Subunit: 285 residues, 6 copies
C-alpha cells in the first residue's frame, strides 16, 4: 500500500527541504500578502492530468509550516481521472497563496514520476514479467527525496538511494582499476560486508568475470534485447545466486522486449529524466 | 550573449547549492573510491542529444569543489550535434567519479531547459514575432537557479525570479480581495514604488479594469488565440503603456498562434515542467 | 496601515534569523538560568523614549521560540510617549531572562528606524510634499529584514529590498561600461522585462541621456537643492514617464528644501545609518 | 590595533561574510552584465572624521569575491577626510557586488570605534585610568563586528555573550527573591572559572552583593553625586571588588562619572547611538 | 541535578538533535514499514551501575520524533542494575528510529557522570572540599552533553570553551618568549570580565605567574610529593590565587593529589576514558 | 591498507564537521591569540600511548582550515610505541594553538578506537579465526564518521554506516510486527532489492524462522559461547547462504571463545563505547 510509504521519510531532512523551498521562492518581503490579507480561506486542489497521485507528505509539510491544513479526498497512490477534486486546503489567505506554487510544483513532479513508474510497471506486468522496475541516480540534484519517493508510489523500486547504499562498479571504475577482475575484487574487499556489490557489464565475458570475482548483482548495460536474453540465461545457469539487471536505452515503448525470465531488475533513466509533471491547480473558493 | 551569463550567478548561493548536492549524493563513507584510487585521471564529456549546451558554471563549480579542472571545447550556449566531445575533466580518479553523476544531472537538466527555450524562441522568430518568450515559477523546488539560468542560455527571459521581484495579482488574489479593482489598488498601494504590478486576467473586461487601476502588465490567461488577439489589440489601443503577456496551455506546437503584434511576452510552463533532460556521459580515458 | 505589515515577513527567513540571534547571545551553557529557575513569571515592557513602536513580530518570534507569550497594550506603529507600559511577557523565568536582551535589542533598533522614518515623513508632509520617503541599501549586514520593516512601519518606503528587486546603474557602472548610454542600454538589455532600471545621475546632461536610453527612474545624486529643482522640472517636462528620485546628504533638517513638485522619491541613508535605538526595558514583576 | 584581527574566530567570520552576501543578493544579479568581468581598480575614500576599523571584515568580503585589497592606513588610524584609505582590485562585477556590504560593514565598525575613541579620550582628559566598556546592546547577528569595533577604539568589549561572565541584574534579584539569594545562587551555579557581577541600584545592595562574594559590582543609574561616595565606601570595605558604573552615561556627561573608585564605565551609546562613517568606493 | 537542565541553550540543543538524527538516517528508512505507525510503548533499562544523566537530550530526541517519555528516576540518581528507569511512547516507527541515538547519548552522558561521581566520592573520602573538574578533552561536536554529564556527576565543568577564561599554556609561554611576557600579554589582552589561568610545570613558573597577576595557577604533571609543598608556598605568599592540579590524575591516585592548598583537580579521564553505561529500550 | 582509507571520506561532510568543531571550541573572540601572535611556528606531535595511529585526514583538515601544514613521520595505521615523534605542524602561532585541542581530541579518539579494533583483530587471528570483527551503531552522536573510520584503520569492519545501509530487524521490530516471520517478510518486501536484511535472533528457533523467511544475515544475540556454536553449526548446515554474526557482551577478553568456524562476523560495542582515547600532545618548539 502506497498510504504507508510516508513512513519511510526522514523527518529532519523533510523539514529542512521544505524550509529551503520556501526560502527559494520568497527570500525577502512578500508584498502580495497585503492583497490577500489574513482572513481564513479555503482552496480546492484540482487534478487536470491523468496518472498517479503522489507527494501528499510533501504537500502537507509545506502547508503545515505555513499554518494551513489539508484534507485529501483521494489516498496517496490513487489513479487520477481529470478533472478531479483531490483535496481541500484551509488557512489564512496569504499563507495559502504563499505556499501554492511550491506545493503544486512538488506534487506535480512527484506525481509525474509516479505516473511514469506505474505505466512502466503496467507494461511489464502485461508482458508477464514479475521482477522490479527501478529508477537510477539520474535525479534532479537536491530533489532526490521526492523523486525516489515518487518512484515507490508508482510501484517501481527506487534502486540505491545514494553512493552509501550499494557499491556500484561501472565502466569508469573498471578503467581506473585496470580491468574487471581488479575492480570487482577491490570493490568486494573495500565494501563493508553489509553492502552488496553490483557491476556494470557491457558483454557476457565481463558479466562472467564479475560473477566469478564475487558480484551480488550484474547490470547488463546497453544490450540489444536479442543479445540480452541469451546473456542473462547463461549467467543465471552458471551463477544462480547473482541477480541480473538490465539498463540503458529502455523506454516505456521498448520495455516489453527487455522483460525476460532471467532478468530480475529493469532500471530506467526516463522515469526521472523524462517524466512530464502533472497539471494541478489550487483555486481559492 | 550566453558566455557572459555566468556573471549573473550569486556565488555564495552557488557554493551552498553544490555542497548540498554532493551531500545528497554521498552523505557518509564512499567505498567505491577505493576501487578507483587517487591517481590523476582524465575523462571526456560527450554530448549524445541535439539541443543547446547550458550549465557550464554549475558543472565547473561541482568539479572545482572536488579538486578537478574542466576544459570546454564548446562555449556555453552552443548548438549540440551528437555525438560531440564537449569537454575534458581532470583530477584524482575518485574525485572525478564522485562528481560525475551530479555534474551530468545538472548539465542534462539545464541543457534540456535551454534546448526547449531555444526551440520556442526559434518558432516565434519564424512566425515574425519580436517579443520575449519567458518562463514561469513552475520550477523544481530547490533548483530554480539552474532552471532560470537555463532559460536565459536558451534565449528566453526568466520572468520574475521569485515573489520579491514583481507583484503578480492572480485569480486567487482577486477572489481574496473581493474583485479586480480592489486587488490591483491594494497591490499598487502595497508594492514598493520600485516594483511593477502585473495582473492575471481571464477576460477583456478584467484586463481593462486592471489597466485602469494602474497595472504595469496585464497577463491574458488561458485565452484561445482567436479571442486573445482582438483583446490585446483593444488593450494596446486604449492603454499603450501597458505590456501584454499571454500564458496558459501554450506549447511549442501552438506557440505561433499566440504570437501577435500586440503581445509583448509569451510565457510557457512547459519550458521547465516538460523539458526532457539531454543525454551526456563522462567516459574516463 | 502598520498592524498589517507583519504579513510581508517571510516566515522561514524569520525563524532562522531568531535562531541565529539566540545562538549568538548564548552558544553554550547558561549558568544564570539557575539563578532565576523555571517558575512561571511575568515581565512588563517599558518604553522610555518618544517615537514610533516597531518590531512586534520579531519580539514575538524571539519569545515564542523560548516558550513565552506576549500581550501588546499598543498596536504596531503607535506613537510612544514615555514612560509607557507597552506589553506583558509571560513564561518560565529563565526563558524570559534568556530572551530579554535580544528582544529589546531588536525592538530598540526597529523602533529607532521607524521613528526616524516617521519624523522624515512628518517633515515632508509639513512642507506640502506627497511623494515617497525611502530608505537605501545602507543597512546593517544580516539585519536588513528588521531595518526595511522598520522603515515601513514609520511610513517610509523601503526602496529595493536587495540587488534582485531593481537594476540600479550607479557612477561605478557608468565608469565600467564606458559611459551613461552604454550602461543604461546594457542595463535595459540585461534586466528581465519585469524589472525597472534606475540610473544615478550627477548632472542634468546625464539625466537626459539616461531618460533617452530608457530609464524608468532617474536618481539625482548629491545636488544642492537650488540645482535639483530646475533639473527635475526640465526632466519631468521632457520625460513625464520617468520617475525622479533625490538622494545624497539629505537629513531630517534639510529635507524640506529637497521636497518639490517634480521629485517623486526622496531616499535617506540616515534613516538606517544614523537612527539611534529607542530605550526599552523589560522588568520582571 | 593592527594585532586585534588575530582575535577573530575564522569559522564564524567566513559564515558571517557568506550570509551577508546571501542577504544582499540571493538570486540572479543582472547588474553584473553591465560591468563585465574586466580587471578593475577602485579607491576607498573616507569622507568622515573618526577612527578606521573593520579591515578584516572588508578583506574577508573581498577575498570571497576574488578581489584584493591594499591598505594605505593601518587599522585604528585617525581619519582626516577626504582620505584615500585603500585600493581594491578584481573583476569589475565582483568589485561592484561586494561594494555596498563591504562599505556598510566598515561604516558601522568605524562608527563604533570612533565613538569609543572619543569616550576614551574624554576619560583620559579627565584624569581617569579605567576601562571604558561596551554592553550587550548590540545589533543582533552583528555582535562580532560591533565588539571588535569597540576594541579598535580602545574601549573594552565587556563580556562577549551570556557565557563569559555571570551577571546578576534587577530581574534576577526579583526572581530569586533578593540580592543575597541571587548572588549566592549565582556564585554556586557559576563554574569556578567565571566571575560574578551584580547590578546594584543602591549602596545597601552593593554592600550585600560584595558580602555575598561578587567579583564586580555595577552601580546602575546613579547620579554622579551619589555614585562617588558609594564607590568610595565600597572600595574602602571591599578592596577586592571591582566597581563598574553604567546607566545614562554619554560622551557629554562621562567626565562626571570618572572617579578614582570606578574601575569600569560602560556605555550603551557606543553601540546604540554611534552614527556610521561615510565611505565610498570609486572605480577608476 | 534536576535543575541542571535549565543551563542548556535551547537553540543549540534542537540543532544538535537534528544533526544526530540526520547522521543516523539521511535518506529513506525502510525499517519503518516493518514496525508501522501503531502506538507503542517501550521500557528503558539500566544494565550498569553508576549515575543517570542526559534526560534532557533523551527527551529532546524523542519529542522531535513525536514520542513522550516518563522518568521513574530523577536526573542524577544512582543506578542499581537491572532497573526500569523510564517509559517511552509513540508511533512504533518513531520510537525505533530514535532508539539508538537516544541510548547512545544517555549511555555517554551517564558514563561521564558516573566517572565524575566516583571521583567526587573518592575526594570527599580523603577529606577534600575543592572542585573536581573536567577539561577541554571532549569529543568534538559533543561538548554540551559531556560538560553537562560532568555537572550531573557533581564535578565542575571547567571553562566551557576558549571564550570562558584565558588559559596560558606551555605553548603560549614558548610563543611569547617566557612566563612573565605571556601572563602580562594575557592580562592586557583579556577583557576585564575574564580570569587568566596559567599552566605551570614548576614552582618557579607558578611564582612568576602569580606575580604577573594570574587568577589561577595550574600545577601540571607534578608528582604529589612536589605538588603539596609547591601549593603550600603559593597559598602562603599569594592567598588570592586559586590553585589547580592536573596531569596524570586518575580515580586511583586522586586521593594523593588532594591537599588543603589545592582548590581544583581536573581530570582528562572523566571524559577521555569514561566507558558508556549499558542501557536498552525494549518495546513491550 | 590503511593509507588508502582516507579516500572513503565524503569531502563535503568532512569540511562541515571541521567547521562545526572549531565553532564549538571558539564561537566568539579568542583573546589568547594576542598572547601567541601570528609569527610562523612549528610544533611537534607526540604519541604518549601504545596502540594504532588513526585520524590523520581529520587532523589535516582541521589544520588546513587554519592555514597550517602537517608532515607525518608515521603513516596512518602505524603501531605507536611511546614516546614517539609522530608529526610536525607549521603555521602562524595563534592558528596552531587554536586548532591544537580539537585536533588532539580527534586524533586521540580515532586512534583509541583503532587500537581497540586492532587488539580485537589480533586476538581473533590468534584464535585461528578468519571472519570480520565489526563495530555497531553504538557511536557518539555527531561523530560517527571519525569512529567508523577508526574501526577501519584498526582492521575491523565498520558494519552498516547508518539506517540506510542495511535493514536490521531487531527484537523490537519482531514485537512490533507480531512475530519473527511477519517481521522478516515485511522487511524483505519493504527493503529495496539492493539492500540486505539482517535479523537479530535470541534462539535457534528464531534463527531458523529468519533464514526460512529470507534473511541474508542472522545475528545471534547474547548467546553464551556453549549455545552459540552448535546453533551456528546447525544454521550453516541447513542454510549455507546465510551469513552468521555473533553479538552481545563480547569483550576483548572473551572474544576467542566467540570465534568459531560457522561464525562469519563478530561485532562489539566496546570497540566504540569503551575505547579509551590515546594520549597525544602538540609541543611548540
Ligand atoms: O545513475 C546511474 O548511473 C544508474 C543507472 C542504473 C542503475 C543505477 C544507477 C546508480 O548510479 O545508482
Ligand atoms: O508560476 C506561475 O504561475 C507563473 C506563470 C506565468 C508567468 C509568471 C508566473 C510567476 O508566478 O512568476
Ligand atoms: O545603498 C545605496 O547605495 C542606495 C542609496 C539610495 C537609493 C538606493 C540605494 C540602493 O542601492 O538600493
Ligand atoms: O547589555 C547590558 O544590558 C549590559 C549593560 C552594561 C554592562 C554589561 C551588559 C551585558 O549584559 O553584558
Ligand atoms: O583541555 C585542556 O588541555 C585542559 C586541561 C585542564 C584544564 C582545562 C583545560 C582546558 O583547556 O579547558
Ligand atoms: O547498534 C546496534 O544496535 C548494533 C549492534 C550490532 C550490529 C549492528 C548494530 C546496528 O544497529 O548497526
Amino acid at each position: 500500500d502506497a498510504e504507508g510509504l510516508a513512513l519511510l521519510l526522514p523527518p529532519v531532512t523533510l523539514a529542512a527541504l521544505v524550509d529551503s523551498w520556501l526560502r527559494e521562492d520568497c527570500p525577502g518581503l512578500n508584498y502580495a500578502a497585503l492583497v490577500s490579507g489574513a482572513g481564513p480561506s479555503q482552496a480546492a486542489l484540482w487534478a487536470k492530468s491523468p496518472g498517479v497521485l503522489a507527494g501528499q507528505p510533501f504537500f502537507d509539510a509545506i502547508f503545515t509550516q505555513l499554518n494551513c491544513q489539508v484534507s485529501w479526498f483521494l489516498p496517496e497512490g490513487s489513479k487520477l481521472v481529470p478533472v478531479a477534486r483531490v483535496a481541500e486546503v484551509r488557512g489564512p489567505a496569504h499563507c495559502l497563496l504563499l505556499g501554492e506554487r511550491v506545493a503544486l510544483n512538488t506534487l506535480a513532479r512527484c506525481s509525474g514520476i509516479a505516473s511514469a513508474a506505474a505505466a512502466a510497471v503496467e507494461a511489464a506486468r502485461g508482458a508477464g514479467w514479475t521482477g522490479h522496475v527501478a529508477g537510477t541516480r539520474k535525479t534532479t540534484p537536491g530533489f532526490r527525496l521526492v523523486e525516489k519517493y515518487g518512484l515507490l508510489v508508482g510501484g517501481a523500486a527506487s534502486h540505491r538511494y545514494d553512493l552509501g547504499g550499494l557499491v556500484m562498479v561501472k565502466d569508469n571504475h573498471v578503467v581506473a582499476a585496470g580491468g574487471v577482475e581488479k575492480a570487482v575484487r577491490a570493490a568486494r574487499q573495500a565494501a563493508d560486508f553489509t553492502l552488496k556489490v553490483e557491476v556494470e557489464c557491457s558483454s557476457l565475458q565481463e558479466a562472467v568475470q564479475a560473477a566469478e570475482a564475487g558480484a551480488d548483482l550484474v547490470l547488463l548495460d546497453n544490450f540489444k534485447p536479442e543479445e540480452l536474453h541469451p546473456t542473462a540465461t547463461v549467467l543465471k545457469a552458471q551463477f544462480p545466486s547473482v541477480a541480473v539487471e538490465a539498463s540503458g536505452g529502455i523506454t516505456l515503448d521498448n520495455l516489453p522486449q527487455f522483460c525476460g525470465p532471467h532478468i530480475d531488475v529493469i532500471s530506467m533513466g526516463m522515469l526521472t529524466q523524462a517524466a512530464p509533471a502533472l497539471d494541478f491547480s489550487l483555486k481559492l473558493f
